[PDB]
Symmetry: C2
Subunit: 740 residues, 2 copies
């Protein structure tokens, strides 16, 4: 049946919303351009600009290098997709009867092999763009945030947040518009075969996350090598400020924030958005919506994202125009209110969307069977994801903000040294997983019960329906991070650094939250994808108690540890090289410590560049090859266990690592800020307590910025990869069992 | 058909081998008593006053601890009787056999009562396991010290002999009490072997239940002391490890016995007991138990019987035949024990498989009787036997300072504590790869040949050499105490260097112990899980259903929740300990100088208090989970909980224990300075050394409190779920029956 919203309306609505989000982005970038600076104390404006140029140059330089390799791998992998998928049917041009309706004729598998390759390259390119554009806004906004810190926290908050919003709206609108264009273009060929149309479209999410994996790991190793070395020698060893221009590793540190925390994070979340939409589309494609060619209801997930863009635009105005911050304690609650307002507004918007864009009754594909589902049930599926996210947000704030006991107790444990700081920080992280998991479990149960894999997919998308805002508050953080980096390097007033420090502490929390959303939605979408894989692979039952499934389960559960081993070791080793180099300069460059001689920043940039371009390959190989090796050698049943295991296991370590690192960082920020009697008693900077906090913070650096956040990509990537290659594994896989 | 070995041969063989194991243990204790002492000669007295202090403190805490757990044990036995008694409304009449409708079985109420009995038997045998181990350990520690005056080889021997006393006593005792209980229970049950062995699984629930609290309680006690002592003593005050001026040193050394010995003993007993019981429950409704073939039915105990003899002979090799002259011989001699035992036991299992099984039989396999050949069972127990050896090898590689991973971790101390920790975390994560593969291969091989019986019997294979296993492991804390006593006795520097060498090998040895514990825990839990699914009459555990999946993800979360509790508890107590040690050094005149004596008792009290109180919540989480989920959500959801906690929890268990042990041995590497590289990180007190100590104390709760207790979390929930399966299947799933 039709929805109230006609098919042609939907065709207009979606791009109109994408354009509005892009226009909003441009507008905000315009208001940000009103902060003037140039390299041509006017000396402080000039100095900020030179430091900005050095960071902008370094970030653009690394991404070009990183993206070169990644782009080459993308082209190579696109060839694997075409060959493997095309080999399922012997590269035949013959049409065959539709698997979803034998009375109809469908386009040949070969075309779907071709179009899958096309959508994979689309998604890979859009992912690269997402990280790159993010880096361009951040390296533009950073020094403008620093100058605005002269007028106070509030003002600096606005430019950092407006800019964060520039990244959020661009990335969401562009991801939505590309997906919308791909669908229409593919439709010209596929016609009434919507089954094959949306099967080909799933490459979009595979391309998104493939590129994101390397972006996150690569950028992550770069930034943390620099960060750890800079901090340990400068702060623990040489008793100088954080980001002191005498430190040779500092430019690389600050390039690092843009190259990992921004560019990697942006690709990462684009991957989340693309997989969630694609997962919803495929299940819908062989459900009542796709089978009856009802465009509006078919595109229900895109309509949800369209309204999310508009909802977030409104929400943004509360932080941007309707409120002014005047005190430091207002920063975090303003960020939190962004999540609360969007959640409340999006709940109404999802209700409207479910009312106009769905028929009241319809059927959802449920493992071979059409299940009767009502529109108010679908409303609940997306709403429970959206609300699970907010919960995850509130909980993650509790565990990572220095406004609450857990982090203050972590800081407090520094009084007995580094070892107690770390014991307390590890325990906090472990503790932190409890409620997010229960929230995710509730989303799964609710959405699984109402609408099977479609419901779960749409719950994932629900959690990401407010992605423009989520990205805004997240991207706000590394921009505020660089801003204080620039303030210190430019030799600015202490009052400036105190304000940037307040913005940056809130950005640590907001970064943790962003990881909570990525992990939550990854658990959801991976389960939707897992269930779709099982159908696509003609598995009758994924039975835990068969030898093939179980070995997949326990091996899958180990993958996140193997992956974390590799990334931790990489950062550890490169940071070790970094400490040696920084020590060498402090110890052998005459006048460096006295500020009369300038250090060699390029060498530190090179150390972190060489380690990340090299060391990103094994962890990327582990994730990308696992489904292929398991699918080809052991078959689809074993891969099933691998998908379930990696999901349930990876999510625990992902969460605990991200929150542990977050807690260590803000515990240190709390000592640095000395804003209460307790904080002050752990001070001053340079005290044994502070240096113990720094030890904890630097251990947390690769935890929260390299391994931790990349884990969500491991999970969700192996799941789309498995789905896309499913026909190939089902037909030509399981070799070991076939030859024995 | 039947075996070559007659039922009566088996009835005699099993206790004969136990009593041999006890005799051989009683023997080694006599030899150790040839070393004499009572409270140079100034030293011998001091060593004995120190020993007495440690022995007094160990005994005191266990009585306190065992008092709490014994009372919990009585409370829980009541729940077993009630819940299992309620399945058939406390009827006294027989009913149809759960495994065969066409037959009549003993009433469920009787089985409710015998489960309670075997539970209490298992609890008591678990405390006796822990207690005896503590007795011999606190007996042999000063005796290892005084024979350290006469070189490494001597001290090693009295240490290893004393560890054999524990290994052989626990192994022989656990086997004898089970054998006896089976024979006693068989009086009532008669031909109903299904009911007999369903009752007997209480034994496994008993051992592991009391083990949970002894590992956790004992683990929190020891690491509170350990961390406080090492932080104020070595980091802050620049005084030697185990220095008598440090008020926490008695508590530290008490802790090695109360935790690493007693807790660990209970732990491995539980492993032994659950493994045997799991093999018995599946066999009992297979051709062996249906044809009432007593020999074949008791195949698991016959494997354990020969295991003792094999370990006895293996022991002679390190005790008699060979002698250590260079410290670099210790680690090899201990691994030799593993290799020799694995080789001799491969022969013994083949023999046992040849004489105790029919050539063909059937194994219960989810409703269907599955054809299995005795040569296939041989491979099931052997594959578990060899997976254990592989796990030991890989664990040595990642924890011993004779290889690159640990040496690299030590090396990273040049760049501070932060790099030491990052490198140690990564080593732990990395260390899980091969053990999981070995475990997955054992699972595939044993599952394919013989379903859950095969898996259960692969678990027992990995624990078939448990006497040797416990011997090498118990050797460690004795050696650890031995050097603590040496230093407290003010003895020469060469004494401490010897004991430090012994102590270092014992670190690796403890990591290996944990590998066997986690390896067999994965295997037994999987078999138990499979028996739980049958007993609860679940057709299929389908991962893609809402009930199973939410159980899967929540179960995967449980080991982190558990790790959170046990780490914070150590972190909190050790924070107090540091403040207490600082207080004594900063208030008591003559303390730092050495003209005054510290109050050791305030440190004992801090860790005593913290452990007794803080062991409760993680014990609650583990005991309550199957009850809460089974009653509220049902057997489908609990099935997910069991699978998820298993696959998730072994990862964090392995990584935590190896990271911990690696940090410890990297520290020992620096403290020994036995190479140019080691020496370049020294001397003791250097920045590198202090960074190592930071890492070591972080690894303390990881490897001694949370890590090793994780293996108990997993196997405990599994038997707990199996025991209460009829109850959950009948009266559980409430939330779904209401809404
Ligand atoms: K941040
Ligand atoms: K030890
Ligand atoms: Mg830093
Ligand atoms: Mg930064
Ligand atoms: Mg910074
Ligand atoms: Mg930060
Ligand atoms: Mg950092
Ligand atoms: Mg210690
Ligand atoms: Mg000790
Ligand atoms: Mg010791
Ligand atoms: Mg040790
Ligand atoms: Mg220790």
């Amino acid at each position: 049946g039709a929805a109230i919203l006609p098919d042609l309306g939907t065709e207009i609505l979606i791009p109109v919303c994408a354009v509005i989000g892009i226009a909003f982005a441009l507008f905000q970038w315009l208001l940000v351009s009103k902060v003037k600076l140039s390299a041509v104390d006017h000396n402080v404006v000039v100095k900020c600009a030179e430091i900005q140029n050095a960071i902008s140059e370094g970030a653009t330089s690394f991404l070009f290098t990183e993206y070169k390799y990644v782009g080459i791998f993308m082209v190579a992998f696109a060839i694997l997709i075409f060959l493997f998928l095309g080999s399922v049917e012997g590269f035949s041009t013959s049409p065959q009867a539709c698997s979803y309706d034998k009375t109809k004729t469908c386009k040949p598998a070969l075309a779907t092999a071709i179009f899958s390759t096309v959508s994979f390259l689309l998604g890979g390119v859009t992912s690269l763009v997402s990280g790159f554009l993010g880096m361009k806004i951040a390296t533009y906004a950073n020094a403008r945030t620093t100058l605005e810190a002269r007028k106070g926290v509030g003002k600096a908050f606005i430019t950092a947040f407006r800019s964060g919003a520039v990244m959020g709206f661009l990335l969401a609108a562009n991801g939505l518009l590309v997906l919308y264009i791909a669908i229409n273009l593919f439709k010209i060929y596929y016609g009434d075969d919507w089954g094959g149309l949306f099967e080909a479209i799933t490459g979009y999410g595979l391309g998104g996350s493939s590129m994101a994996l390397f972006g996150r790991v690569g950028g992550g190793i770069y930034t943390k090598a620099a960060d750890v070395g800079a901090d340990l020698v400068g702060k623990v060893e040489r008793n100088i400020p954080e980001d002191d221009p005498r430190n040779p590793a500092v430019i690389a540190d600050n390039v690092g924030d843009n190259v990992g925390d921004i560019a990697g994070m942006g690709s990462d979340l684009f991957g989340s958005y693309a997989e969630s939409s694609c997962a919803a589309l495929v299940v819908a494609s062989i459900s009542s919506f796709g089978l009856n060619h009802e465009l509006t209801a078919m595109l229900y997930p895109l309509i949800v994202s369209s309204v999310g863009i508009l909802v977030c635009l409104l929400t943004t105005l509360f932080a941007t125009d309707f409120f002014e911050i005047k005190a430091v304690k207002e920063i975090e609650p303003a960020l939190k209110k962004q999540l609360v307002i969007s959640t409340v507004l999006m709940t109404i918007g999802v209700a409207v969307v479910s009312f106009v864009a769905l028929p009241t009754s319809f059927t959802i594909f449920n493992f071979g069977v059409q299940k009767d589902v009502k529109s108010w049930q679908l409303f609940l599926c997306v709403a429970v994801g959206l609300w699970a996210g907010l919960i995850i947000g509130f909980v993650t704030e509790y565990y990572t903000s220095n406004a609450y006991s857990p982090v203050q107790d972590v800081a407090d444990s520094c009084r007995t040294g580094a070892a107690t700081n770390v014991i307390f920080g590890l325990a906090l992280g472990y503790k932190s997983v409890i409620i997010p998991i229960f929230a995710i479990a509730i989303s799964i149960f609710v959405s699984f019960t109402f609408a099977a894999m479609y419901g779960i997919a749409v719950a994932a998308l629900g959690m990401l329906s407010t992605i423009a805002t989520g990205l805004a508050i997240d991207a706000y953080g590394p921009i505020s991070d660089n801003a204080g980096g620039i303030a210190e390097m430019a030799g600015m007033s202490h009052r400036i650094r105190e304000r940037t420090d307040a913005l940056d502490a809130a950005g640590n929390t907001t970064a943790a939250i962003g990881k909570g959303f990525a992990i939550g939605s990854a658990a959801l979408v991976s389960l939707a994808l897992f269930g779709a894989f099982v159908s696509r692979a003609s598995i009758t039952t994924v039975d835990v108690l068969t030898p093939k499934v179980f070995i997949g389960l326990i091996v899958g559960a180990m993958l996140p540890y193997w992956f974390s081993a590799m990334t931790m070791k990489s950062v550890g080793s490169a940071a070790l090289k970094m400490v040696e180099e920084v020590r060498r300069q402090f110890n052998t460059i005459p006048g460096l410590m006295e500020g009369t001689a300038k250090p060699d920043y390029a060498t530190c940039v090179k150390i972190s560049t060489d380690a990340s371009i090299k060391e990103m390959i094994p962890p990327g190989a582990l994730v990308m090859l696992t489904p292929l090796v398991v699918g080809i050698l052991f078959g689809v049943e074993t891969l099933s266990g691998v998908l379930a295991g990696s999901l349930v296991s990876g999510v625990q370590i992902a969460i605990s690592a991200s929150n542990t690192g977050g807690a260590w960082d803000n515990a240190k920020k709390y000592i640095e800020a000395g804003a209460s009697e307790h904080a002050r008693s752990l001070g001053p900077k340079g005290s044994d307590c502070h240096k113990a906090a720094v030890i904890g913070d630097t251990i947390g650096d690769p935890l929260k910025d390299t391994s931790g956040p990349s884990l969500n990509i491991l999970i969700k990537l192996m799941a789309v990869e498995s789905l896309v290659f499913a026909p190939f594994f089902a037909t030509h896989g399981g070799l070991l069992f076939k030859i024995f």
